[PDB]
Ligand SMILES: C[C@]12CC[C@@H]3c4ccc(O[C@@H]5O[C@H](C(=O)O)[C@@H](O)[C@H](O)[C@H]5O)cc4CC[C@H]3[C@@H]1CCC2=O
Ligand SMILES: [Zn+2]
């Protein structure tokens with residue numbers, strides 16, 4: 460199906476850092492009528508997944524100003540202008556352009572040791 | 573506030589069955605497509621099933637065809653998932669997730685219910 464590879468699998472950060480995470484699609488998301496249906500979820504530790512961004516750049520309801528997304532085709536990026544403690548957890552990209560809807564390999568945002 | 577609460581998980585013997593429930597509140601449940609996503613120990617996420625507001629399944633993976641059933645009781649604002657012939661791989665955290673027309677994907681997710689398959 461469509462594989463979504465997330466780089467890096469783990470990202471050690473410091474609060475206040477500006478980070479960019481990647482999601483590479485195994486197949487183009489512009490091959491049909493559902494162009495770039497690429498979304499991002501945050502799974503905070505001990506909590507359920509929350510929608511951050513949908514359709515590459517759209518900030519979902521309740522998503523702070525510091526989150527943004529870019530990309531077209533096969534390479535998508537999620538950017539966090541200033542990491543807060545509430546931003547740590549597992550980030551999952553997901554595509555709904557093609558059937559079935561699939562989820563990415565994940566990027567764990569964690570405090571740098 | 574949109575709320576989703578799964579229930580019914582627990583310990584199951586190899587080859588047994590599971591019936592999960594997800595009761596919805598804070599929205600008009602009968603107008604939303606719904607889904608079940610399972611999360612393995614490895615934190616991998618996988619779509620198990622999807623249903624329209626009409627109660628018709630719109631998706632099942634072929635790796636489970638014959639062992640899964642997704643249903644809804646709109647009046648009870650409840651979503652169900654039935655799975656039979658459980659194997660060691662069915663062990664996961666099972667989440668119900670609301671489907672959003674604008675996202676064309678999941679918006680809200682419940683807390684999840686755990687199914688633990690035991691030999
Ligand atoms: C599961 C799925 C990915 C998600 C796709 C989706 C994602 C969101 C979605 O939204 C639903 O849209 C209805 C509509 O279009 O009228 C509105 O009425 C509902 O209020 C809303 O809940 C609908 C669909 C239909 C097909 C689904 C695919 C089938 C195969 C697959 O992989
Ligand atoms: Zn594939």
Ligand SMILES: [Zn+2]
Pocket residue numbers: 460461462561
């Ligand atoms: Zn895949």
Ligand SMILES: [Zn+2]
Pocket residue numbers: 491556557558
């Ligand atoms: Zn396709």
